[PDB]
Structure formats: structure tokens, C-alpha cells
Amino acid sequence: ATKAVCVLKGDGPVQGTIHFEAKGDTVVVTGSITGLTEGDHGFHVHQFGDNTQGCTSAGPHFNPLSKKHGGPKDEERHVGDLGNVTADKNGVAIVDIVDPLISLSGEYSIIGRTMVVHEKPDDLGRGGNEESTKTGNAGSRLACGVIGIAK
């Protein structure tokens, strides 16, 4: 608990460092991401901290509340979803988010979990068809990292 970090790496040029700090009931997520394609991209916490098959072994979005996929904002959201980060350039940006949903407090604690940044934007809470409604239509994950304590 309290104060955690995650370093985003991949087989592509995408890298970043994200920090997470509990500020009571909420988690403040900050950081930089670089080496991207300009615009918004899918930013989620994927159920496992497994790097045995790269960013694939992470699996789906952490949803301990069996639900569907949305934005940070929808009630109908996946604990694991934090929406989209926006890049500009270089092909960098912006991580500052405050979440009432995720944690590190157990049963909804996001540590030992993987942080992924996808290669396309999230349809967030609304839009698509099947893969929208539990995925984002974000797609190819180019960087991921297991979330670990810090202090």
C-alpha cells in the first residue's frame, strides 16, 4: 500500500513511468509516457502482473465486479479503466488522473497488476458493438508494466 510505481516498456518505442499515491479513498495517478502516435490512447489496468508472454500475459481489464467496459466516469465501468491519455509532441503526455474506483487496499488493489497503454483510443463508456462493451476498441498494447510498491 500507499505510493506505488509502474514503468512502462515494450518491443516498440513506447516508454513511460506512472506513479500512484493513495490520497484517501482516491488514487492519484501521475506520470509521463513517451514514444507514441499523437492523440488519445487507451489506458488501463489489466488483471495480471504476468510478463511471461510480454504484455499479453496480463489478460483482460481488472473487473472484480463482473461488469462492462466504460470510462473513468461511467458507473458502468471496469475497475481497470482510466480511459485515454493524450499525446502531443515528441509523442508525449499527460498522466494526471484521480480515481474513486481503483485502489491498493486489496480487493480492488491494483498492485501486482499491469498498467497498459494501447495503440488506439478507447470508445470509453458509450459506443461500439461487442469488443467495445468490454474491451475499448483500444487494441494493440505497446507498453506495459507490473505496478509495484514505492515509498
Residues that bind a copy of itself (CB under 8 A): 1, 4-7, 17, 47-52, 59, 104, 106, 111-114, 145-151
- Asked whether position 44 contacts Cu ion by CB under 5 A, the answer is yes
Task: Tell whether 44 is in a known binding site.
Answer: yes
By a kind-dependent CB cut-off of 5 to 8 A, residue 1 interacts, out of a copy of itself, Zn ion, Cu ion, none, with a copy of itself
Q: Bridge-partner residues for 116, per DSSP? A: 44, 144
Active-site pick, 41, 77, 113, 118? 118
Comparing CA positions, the residue from 100, 110, 107 lying closest to residue 19 is: 110
Which cell numbers hold the place of 99? 480515481
**Binding test (CB under 5 A) with Zn ion, winner from 69, 113, 118, 141:** 69
Comparing CA positions, the residue from 73, 93, 91 lying closest to residue 81 is: 73
Which cell numbers hold the place of 95? 498522466
Cell 461511467 maps to which residue? 74
Residue list for the binding site for Zn(2+) = 61, 69, 78, 81
Q: Which residue numbers are catalytic?
A: 44, 46, 61, 69, 78, 81, 118, 141
